[PDB]
Amino acid sequence: QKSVLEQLKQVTMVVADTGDFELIKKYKPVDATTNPSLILKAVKEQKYSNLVAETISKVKANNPDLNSDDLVKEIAIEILVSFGIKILDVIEGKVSSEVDARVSFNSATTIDYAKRIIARYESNGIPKDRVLIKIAATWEGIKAAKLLQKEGINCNLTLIFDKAQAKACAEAGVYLVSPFVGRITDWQMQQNNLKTFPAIADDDGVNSVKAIYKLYKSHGFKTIVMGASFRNVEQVIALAGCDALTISPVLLEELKNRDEHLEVKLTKNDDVVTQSPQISEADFRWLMNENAMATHKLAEGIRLFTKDTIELENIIKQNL
Amino acid sequence: MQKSVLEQLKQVTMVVADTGDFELIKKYKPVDATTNPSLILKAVKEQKYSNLVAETISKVKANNPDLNSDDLVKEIAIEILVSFGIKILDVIEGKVSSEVDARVSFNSATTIDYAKRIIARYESNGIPKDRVLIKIAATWEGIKAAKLLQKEGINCNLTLIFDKAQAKACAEAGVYLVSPFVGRITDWQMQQNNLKTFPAIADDDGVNSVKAIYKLYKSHGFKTIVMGASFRNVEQVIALAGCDALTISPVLLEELKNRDEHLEVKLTKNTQSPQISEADFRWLMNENAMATHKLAEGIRLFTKDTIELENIIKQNL
Ligand SMILES: *[C@@H](CO)[C@@H](O)[C@H](O)[C@H](O)[C@H](O)COP(=O)(O)O
Ligand SMILES: *[C@H](CO)[C@@H](O)[C@H](O)[C@H](O)[C@H](O)COP(=O)(O)O
Numbered sequence: 050q051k052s053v054l055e056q057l058k059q060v061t062m063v064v065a066d067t068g069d070f071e072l073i074k075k076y077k078p079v080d081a082t083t084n085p086s087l088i089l090k091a092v093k094e095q096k097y098s099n100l101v102a103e104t105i106s107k108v109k110a111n112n113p114d115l116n117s118d119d120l121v122k123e124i125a126i127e128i129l130v131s132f133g134i135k136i137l138d139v140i141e142g143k144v145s146s147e148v149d150a151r152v153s154f155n156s157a158t159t160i161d162y163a164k165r166i167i168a169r170y171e172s173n174g175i176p177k178d179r180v181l182i183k184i185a186a187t188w189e190g191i192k193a194a195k196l197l198q199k200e201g202i203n204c205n206l207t208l209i210f211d212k213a214q215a216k217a218c219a220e221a222g223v224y225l226v227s228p229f230v231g232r233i234t235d236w237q238m239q240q241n242n243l244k245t246f247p248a249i250a251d252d253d254g255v256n257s258v259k260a261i262y263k264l265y266k267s268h269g270f271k272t273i274v275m276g277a278s279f280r281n282v283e284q285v286i287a288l289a290g291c292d293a294l295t296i297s298p299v300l301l302e303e304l305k306n307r308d309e310h311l312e313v314k315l316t317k318n319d320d321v322v323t324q325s326p327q328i329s330e331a332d333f334r335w336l337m338n339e340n341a342m343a344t345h346k347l348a349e350g351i352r353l354f355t356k357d358t359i360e361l362e363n364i365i366k367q368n369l
Numbered sequence: 370m371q372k373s374v375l376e377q378l379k380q381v382t383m384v385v386a387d388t389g390d391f392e393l394i395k396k397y398k399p400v401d402a403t404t405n406p407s408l409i410l411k412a413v414k415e416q417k418y419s420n421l422v423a424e425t426i427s428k429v430k431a432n433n434p435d436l437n438s439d440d441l442v443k444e445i446a447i448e449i450l451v452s453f454g455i456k457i458l459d460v461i462e463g464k465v466s467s468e469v470d471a472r473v474s475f476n477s478a479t480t481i482d483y484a485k486r487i488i489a490r491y492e493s494n495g496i497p498k499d500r501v502l503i504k505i506a507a508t509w510e511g512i513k514a515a516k517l518l519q520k521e522g523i524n525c526n527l528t529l530i531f532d533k534a535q536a537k538a539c540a541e542a543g544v545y546l547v548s549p550f551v552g553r554i555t556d557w558q559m560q561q562n563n564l565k566t567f568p569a570i571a572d573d574d575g576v577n578s579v580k581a582i583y584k585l586y587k588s589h590g591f592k593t594i595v596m597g598a599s600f601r602n603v604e605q606v607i608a609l610a611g612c613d614a615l616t617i618s619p620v621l622l623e624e625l626k627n628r629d630e631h632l633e634v635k636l637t638k639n640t641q642s643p644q645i646s647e648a649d650f651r652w653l654m655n656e657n658a659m660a661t662h663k664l665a666e667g668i669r670l671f672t673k674d675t676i677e678l679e680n681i682i683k684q685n686l
C-alpha cells in the first residue's frame with residue numbers, strides 16, 4: 050500500500066530535478082539538481098519574478114565599478130546560486146549547480162567558474178559540502194573535475210551518453226556521474242520515427258545506465274551513478290536500486306500516486322574486482338566518435354544549455 | 370578556338386581528379402589527383418585491378434613471413450594505398466594525395482607515424498616525397514600532426530574541412546593544402562530544411578563555405594592552397610571557377626568536358642590575427658552542428674571502408 054516513490058527511496062537516493070524549489074518539499078527528495086535550462090524555466094515563472102529582480106538590484110548595487118559585461122556575468126552566477134540556496138532550504142542533502150556551458154572545452158576556465166560558484170555559496174553562508182558543481186563530460190570537463198576533486202570540490206559530471214565516457218569520469222575520482230536516459234531514448238525513437246516508447250528491455254537509455262552501473266560495480270568505482278533525464282515512470286522503475294536517480298516533479302508526482310509493489314532491479318555484488326588500464330585522451334576521443342549518438346547528444350546538450358544561458362543573459366540585460 | 374568548360378576551368382584553377390582509378394585520369398589531364406579510403410576500396414574491388422591487388426598480397430606475404438595476421442593485413446593495406454598512388458603518378462605531372470588510416474584521427478603521434486610510413490613506402494618504390502600529399506582528417510589532433518609533418522618537409526592535405534575555424538587553424542599550422550567539402554555541406558542544408566531541389570548557388574552552404582575560406586586566406590596572406598572537394602553537380606564546380614584548385618570526380622569531369630558555354634570566373638585575388646587556441650577551436654566546432662556531425666561521420670565512414678579493405682585482404686590471404 051506504500052507509494053512507489055516511498056519504496057524507491059529505500060533502495061535508491063531520490064533526487065528532484067528542478068529549479069522550482071516550491072515543488073520540492075512535497076516529494077522530500079534527498080538531493081536536488083538544476084541545469085541552465087531548469088534555471089531559465091524558473092526565472093521565467095511569475096512567482097520568482099521578485100527573486101530575480103532582487104538579485105539583479107543587489108548585485109548591481111554591490112558592484113558599481115564592474116563594467117556592464119562583468120556585471121551581467123556576476124548577476125547570472127548569483128541567480129544560479131540564489132535558486133540553489135532556496136533549494137537547500139527545503140532539503141537535507143546537496144544541490145547541483147552547473148558551470149557556464151560556454152567553458153565546456155576549457156579545463157582552466159571550468160575550474161575558475163566552479164570555484165566562483167563555491168565562493169558565492171560560501172559568501173551566502175552555505176558550506177561547500179552541500180553543493181555539487183555540474184560539468185559537461187567532455188574530455189576537458191573531466192580533466193577539470195579531476196583537479197577540483199583533488200582540491201575537495203565535489204563534481205557532478207553530466208551529459209554522459211557513453212560507457213567509455215563514464216569510465217573516464219570514475220578514473221578522475223569524480224563524486225557523481227549523471228548518465229542520461231531520456232535523451233538516448235529520444236535519439237532511438239527519432240531514428241525510425243517511433244511514436245511509442247520502446248519496451249523497457251529495448252530502451253537504449255535504460256540499457257545505457259544499466260551498462261554503466263554494471264561497469265562501476267565490477268571495477269569497484271566509488272563514483273555515484275545517478276540516472277538522469279526521464280520520459281516516463283517505467284524508465285525510473287526499471288532502474289530501481291541504482292545509487293541515485295534524479296527525477297522531474299511531474300514524474301515524482303506519478304510515483305507518489307502509484308501504490309504498486311516495487312522490485313529492485315540494480316544490485317551491488319561481492320564479485321572479484323576488475324582492475325583495468327586508464328582511458329587515455331586519444332582512446333576517449335576515438336570511442337566517443339564511434340558512438341554517433343553520444344557525440345551528437347553531448348555536442349547538442351552543450352549547444353542547448355548555451356542557448357538558455359544566453360537567453361538568461363538577455364533577460365538580465367533587459368532588466369538591468 | 371572554342372573551348373569546353375573543363376578546358377576553360379583549367380586556365381583559372383588547378384583541376385584535380387578525385388579517383389583511385391588511374392585508367393580514367395589521363396583522359397582528363399588533371400594536374401594533381403586525390404584518393405581516400407573509400408576511393409581506394411572501390412578501386413581494389415574492380416576486376417581490372419584484381420590482378421594488381423593479388424600481386425601486392427603475395428609480394429608482402431613473401432617478405433613478411435613471421436608477422437601476425439594483424440600486422441600482415443595492415444602492411445598489405447599500406448602497400449595497396451601506395452601502389453594505386455604510384456600508378457596515378459605515372460599519368461599526371463603533379464602530386465597524388467594518400468590518406469592515413471582514419472583510426473588514428475585523434476592521435477597526433479600515430480598520425481605522424483602513419484604519414485612517415487606512407488612516405489617511406491613511396492621512397493622504397495622510387496618516389497620522392499615531393500610528389501605526395503598526406504591526407505589527414507582536420508581534427509585538432511590531425512592539424513597538430515600536420516604542423517610537425519610540414520616542419521619535416523612532408524606536405525599535407527587537410528581533409529574533412531567543414532568550418533572556417535578548421536581552415537584557419539590549418540593555415541596557421543602552415544599546411545600545404547586544405548580540402549573544404551562542398552557536397553556534404555549542401556547535403557546537410559537540404560536535409561535540415563527538407564529541401565526538394567538544390568539551393569540557389571548564392572545560397573548554397575557548401576559553395577559559400579569555400580568562398581568564405583578562400584576570402585579569409587587571401588585577405589590574411591595565407592599560402593595554404595584552397596581545394597574544393599566533394600561535389601553533387603557541375604553547377605557547384607562552375608560556381609567556384611578561379612579557386613586555387615578543385616578536385617572533381619570522373620563523372621563530373623566528363624560533364625565539364627562536354628559543356629561548351631563561356632565560363633565566368635567567380636573567385637579572384639584583390640590582416641593578421643592571433644592564432645586560434647585548442648579551446649577556441651573546439652568551441653567553434655561545437656557551435657557548428659553540421660561541422661561536428663560531418664567531421665565525425667566522415668571519420669566513421671572512412672574507418673568502415675578501411676575495415677572492409679582489411680576484410681577483403683584477410684579472405685584473400
Ligand atoms: C542534471 C544531471 O544531474 C540534470 O538537471 C540534467 O541536466 C537533466 O536531468 C536533463 O537535462 C534532463 O533532460 P531532458 O531532455 O529534459 O530529460
Ligand atoms: C580528398 C580531398 O582532397 C577527396 O578524395 C575526398 O575524400 C572526396 O572528395 C570526398 O570524400 C567525396 O565525398 P562525397 O560525399 O562522395 O562527395
Ligand SMILES: [Cl-]
Nearest residue numbers: 344345661662
Ligand atoms: Cl554530431
